[PDB]
């Protein structure tokens, strides 16, 4: 699938460090919230679950995918991509996360389609290296355009 189809515009960020574990989820989601792909409750569902148990979607050491079910407050279907130069430690995870990709979907089938698209990035260690070393939002965006 074209990866770019899920990325509106403001969806791609490089950050020195998130302020805390909650702000890392917020920076993974704010670009979707800003175009109302989601409601505010959608972010808080991920935060509350993370506090209660831990991050659901860890795909490799240092790599996460903040997301909640459509019914938690998604409104449309899209993604985000956020890199933290120093990372941040999520509770109950084994090490700090440096790379986060946001996802929202209006329906479970749209969620499956979106997941199958981003698996072409999150399940390819060659892409994970290039995302983790990305000097800029431009280098992050190139990897999206490559999909």
CATH of the domain at 144: 3.40.930.10
Cβ distance 35 to 7 under 8 Å?
no
Distance CA 50, CA 117 (A): 24
The tally of domains found in the chain comes to 1
Residues in Cβ contact with 140 at an 8 Å cutoff, skipping those fewer than 6 apart: 12, 13, 14, 81, 83, 131, 134
Q: Which helix (H) or strand (E) holds 25?
A: helix 21-27
- 74 φ, ψ (degrees, to nearest 5): -75, 155
Is 16 part of the annotated catalytic residue set?
no
C-alpha 104/C-alpha 74 separation (Å) is 6
Structural domain boundaries, residue 39: 1-147
Question: Measured between alpha carbons, how far is residue 70 from residues 21, 117, 120 in Å?
Answer: 22, 17, 22
Residue 98: CA atoms inside 13 Å, Cβ hemisphere, count? 14
H or E stretch including 81?
strand 81-88
Q: Which is the catalytic residue, given 27, 29, 43, 67?
A: 67
């Amino acid at each position: 699938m074209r990866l770019s189809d899920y990325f509106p515009e403001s969806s791609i960020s490089v950050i020195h460090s998130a302020k805390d574990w909650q702000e890392a989820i917020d920076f993974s989601m704010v670009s979707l919230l800003d175009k109302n792909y989601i409601s505010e409750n959608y972010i808080q569902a991920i935060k509350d679950s993370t506090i209660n148990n831990g991050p659901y979607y860890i795909l490799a050491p240092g790599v996460a995918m903040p997301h909640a079910r459509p019914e938690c407050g998604a409104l449309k279907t899209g993604m985000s991509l956020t890199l933290l130069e120093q990372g941040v430690y999520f509770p109950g995870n084994d090490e700090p996360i440096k790379l986060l990709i946001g996802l929202s979907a209006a329906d479970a089938d749209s969620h499956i389609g979106a997941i199958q698209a981003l698996s072409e990035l999150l399940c390819e260690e060659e892409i994970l290296e290039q995302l983790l070393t990305a000097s800029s939002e431009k280098q992050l965006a190139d990897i999206i355009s490559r999909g």
